[PDB]
Amino acid sequence: AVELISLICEETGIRNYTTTKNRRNKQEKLELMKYCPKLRKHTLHKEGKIK
Amino acid sequence: MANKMKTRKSAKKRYSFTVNGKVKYKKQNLRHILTKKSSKRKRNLRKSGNLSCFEVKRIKTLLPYG
Amino acid sequence: GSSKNGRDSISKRLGVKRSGGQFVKAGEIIVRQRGTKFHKGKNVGLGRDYTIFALSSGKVEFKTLKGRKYVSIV
Amino acid sequence: IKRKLRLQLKKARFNASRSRSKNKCFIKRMENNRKIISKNNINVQVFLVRSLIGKLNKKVKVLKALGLNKIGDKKVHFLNESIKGMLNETINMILLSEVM
RNA sequence: GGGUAGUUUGACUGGGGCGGUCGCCUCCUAAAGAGUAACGGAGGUGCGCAAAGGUUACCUUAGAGUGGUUGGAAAUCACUCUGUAAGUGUAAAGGCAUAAGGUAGCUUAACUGUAAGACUGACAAGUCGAACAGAUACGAAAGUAGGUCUUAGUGAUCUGGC
RNA sequence: ACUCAGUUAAACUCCGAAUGCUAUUAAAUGAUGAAUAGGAGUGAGACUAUGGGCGAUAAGGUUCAUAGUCGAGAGGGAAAC
RNA sequence: ACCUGCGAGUUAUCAUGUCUAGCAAGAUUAAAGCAUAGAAGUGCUGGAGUCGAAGCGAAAGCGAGUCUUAAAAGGGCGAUUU
């Protein structure tokens, strides 16, 4: 009941990070302030698919 | 020419020789499931390494020309 | 009726790596341990797994205070 | 007769067949050696009188550090704490005489 | 589609077979560095957690005795003695009063490029790491934060997909 | 439960050796250390003196730790061994 | 069974190490040709090719530096002392 999700930089769309998240516990759309190395600046990353 | 020693191709495709003996190679475990592995572990696995001096003689036998 | 058990882990090689009075340089590992069997004193640091390491060159020393052992670099 | 018992018995008889005269000679030698070692800062001559074969590894290393490799080995040494400790370790295999 | 052909069907094992077992973690065996066998003696495990993480600030149980509607030996509250035996997602050990225990606010460092110097080690691997640059989080600041108190929660190469 | 007295524990320790391990210095012992290059063989051990586990504080039994011997060692002694 | 004979790490090439001989930042020719000889030679001709002389990086590419990177900021592999 745990899936591998990918955190995507909002303003570039690059899949910068991958992480684990438990489905059937929140089924929300996890957002995380992560550092986007393309921009040398922190920004918002959203949950998304892997494949 | 009748009997030139054949190189071991599967070894050629993985080993490299430095100028004065050492052998360069690519580290393992950075090919596959990667989410769980820590970032510093992955960063160290990316950078290439040198083999221990104990394998160099066998490798020099495997790569007779390279 | 065979044996119900027989299972052991790999030995982890803990213990004191540099003896008291030895000369170490910066970054040396002094103790490997689970938990603060030895606590940190002057000029040493504690890793995330309670390893004791030397922040500067010097000579290791162990002191005892209230029954607890402290490691320092002097 | 059972082999366990006869081996025990044969070994016990060999061990017990030692001569008190030889033991007294050994005791006299030990007393002399201890008396000499009790001194301090003298030149002492060390003879090796028992072989190195079969002895403990540590003691063989001590004897080779003193300089004796064979029976009949002669070495003069100046008694300080180090030599005194080595002689005490290997007292049973040496003969100490004093160099006037 | 055994009509016919080419092959596979493991090892350890107090003979073999049957049975049981094969990764990893904790303790003893283990003889006071480390290491050290067995079909030796006992357990857990192929996770969970968007908080049970990070930071700042503020606090301490369990048990014995005594007094209280349900309430009795024991639920909740007050006090005395006791001073960690309580509690630390999950097994056990080593640790934890400065608490690593508990509560609350903010927050995402559960970062990127890196790394002097090491431990463990046949090799391949694994682990600790001051400190540097960028971008932050928290705090007044010094500083801390490169997940989880630490020690199991894992799988090479080749091939293929995004 | 509490008090006094007396006991058991490899997986209990309020305490804790003797040895061993590690560092420094001074002596002592003379190619025993380390590195590189070339070339192997070995990866079936056994016994004794100690510390052990398993077995039945039985076995020339099984499996670990220290040292020696045989292995690869002639000679003398333990009647032969 | 005895005795006497026969009866097993060789040859051809490649890699690498050492020894010997020679040259030297260069060393060396292979196939093949000519001449003489009839003497399956050995004296020339023949430099196509190979190994050194620069490495690093997946490569492009750059070069006593190169790659990892905004960074010689630290290291990895080099070298200036062949």
Side-chain angles (χ1 to χ4, degrees):
Chain A
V2 186
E3 64 200 50
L4 274 58
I5 64 165
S6 166
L7 299 188
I8 312 163
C9 200
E10 276 282 34
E11 315 171 3
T12 313
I14 299 177
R15 287 152 33 165
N16 263 326
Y17 292 108
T18 68
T19 305
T20 43
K21 191 259 289 176
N22 180 222
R23 66 174 67 93
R24 313 294 305 118
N25 205 354
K26 284 191 156 56
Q27 55 280 358
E28 300 161 59
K29 287 308 151 292
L30 181 64
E31 282 88 359
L32 283 182
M33 191 56 41
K34 296 282 262 179
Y35 169 89
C36 198
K38 181 65 183 292
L39 279 74
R40 304 201 173 214
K41 173 191 82 155
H42 268 85
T43 175
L44 184 59
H45 284 52
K46 193 167 318 297
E47 174 182 8
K49 273 52 194 179
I50 290 187
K51 75 179 284 184
Chain B
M1 293 303 289
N3 276 347
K4 290 151 77 175
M5 202 195 168
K6 293 216 191 186
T7 176
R8 169 70 55 96
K9 286 294 186 167
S10 187
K12 186 40 170 288
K13 297 174 190 183
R14 289 186 174 73
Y15 298 150
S16 308
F17 267 122
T18 62
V19 66
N20 50 33
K22 313 185 195 179
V23 166
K24 185 178 88 66
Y25 79 98
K26 174 184 168 69
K27 294 177 175 66
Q28 70 183 352
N29 283 90
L30 194 81
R31 192 76 102 176
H32 200 179
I33 58 170
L34 298 170
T35 284
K36 74 177 76 171
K37 299 183 189 171
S38 176
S39 183
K40 71 163 284 189
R41 205 186 157 203
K42 278 183 287 202
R43 179 168 44 243
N44 262 281
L45 289 182
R46 202 217 322 288
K47 153 173 62 81
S48 78
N50 305 95
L51 280 173
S52 168
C53 295
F54 293 130
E55 272 86 12
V56 175
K57 173 155 65 177
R58 185 158 50 180
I59 293 171
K60 286 172 59 174
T61 299
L62 285 175
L63 302 203
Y65 290 88
Chain C
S2 309
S3 165
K4 189 59 69 184
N5 47 23
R7 260 171 276 102
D8 203 16
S9 61
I10 295 185
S11 304
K12 287 306 177 315
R13 275 97 173 150
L14 313 173
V16 175
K17 295 302 157 183
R18 251 55 165 172
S19 62
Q22 197 174 3
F23 166 82
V24 304
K25 49 185 194 289
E28 292 277 59
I29 295 174
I30 291 168
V31 187
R32 308 222 75 151
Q33 41 181 27
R34 283 86 171 93
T36 59
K37 200 163 159 181
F38 304 95
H39 292 251
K40 53 185 287 298
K42 170 174 183 64
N43 283 356
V44 303
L46 196 72
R48 69 170 294 276
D49 64 0
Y50 301 115
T51 311
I52 310 276
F53 60 97
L55 299 188
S56 48
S57 181
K59 277 192 205 318
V60 172
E61 74 156 48
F62 292 77
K63 289 267 300 187
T64 315
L65 290 169
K66 294 272 166 198
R68 307 271 202 79
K69 293 265 205 292
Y70 289 85
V71 190
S72 314
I73 294 278
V74 297
Chain D
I1 78 173
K2 303 197 174 318
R3 197 180 174 271
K4 195 189 176 186
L5 258 64
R6 70 169 281 267
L7 287 201
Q8 308 182 3
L9 214 50
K10 172 180 195 167
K11 189 183 290 183
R13 296 206 171 124
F14 195 77
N15 285 344
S17 89
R18 187 84 208 286
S19 296
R20 177 67 178 177
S21 76
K22 297 283 189 50
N23 275 359
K24 275 206 75 68
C25 292
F26 165 80
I27 289 180
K28 187 185 312 302
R29 182 161 62 84
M30 290 284 117
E31 300 183 35
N32 168 35
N33 277 5
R34 254 186 297 286
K35 186 174 70 37
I36 301 299
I37 300 168
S38 84
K39 281 189 175 46
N40 199 324
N41 303 327
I42 302 97
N43 272 260
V44 57
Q45 193 179 16
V46 190
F47 297 82
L48 187 69
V49 304
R50 286 211 56 187
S51 163
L52 307 196
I53 298 155
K55 307 310 179 306
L56 264 68
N57 188 30
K58 153 178 52 192
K59 294 199 162 172
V60 169
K61 286 198 266 215
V62 183
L63 291 174
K64 272 177 175 302
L66 271 163
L68 313 162
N69 307 291
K70 316 186 170 302
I71 304 191
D73 266 333
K74 318 266 182 287
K75 286 216 82 68
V76 288
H77 283 340
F78 175 77
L79 278 177
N80 67 80
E81 293 314 317
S82 309
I83 310 285
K84 186 172 304 183
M86 286 192 245
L87 296 198
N88 276 335
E89 288 300 322
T90 78
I91 188 171
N92 74 305
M93 316 177 49
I94 50 160
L95 180 65
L96 301 186
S97 166
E98 189 178 14
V99 176
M100 283 75 73

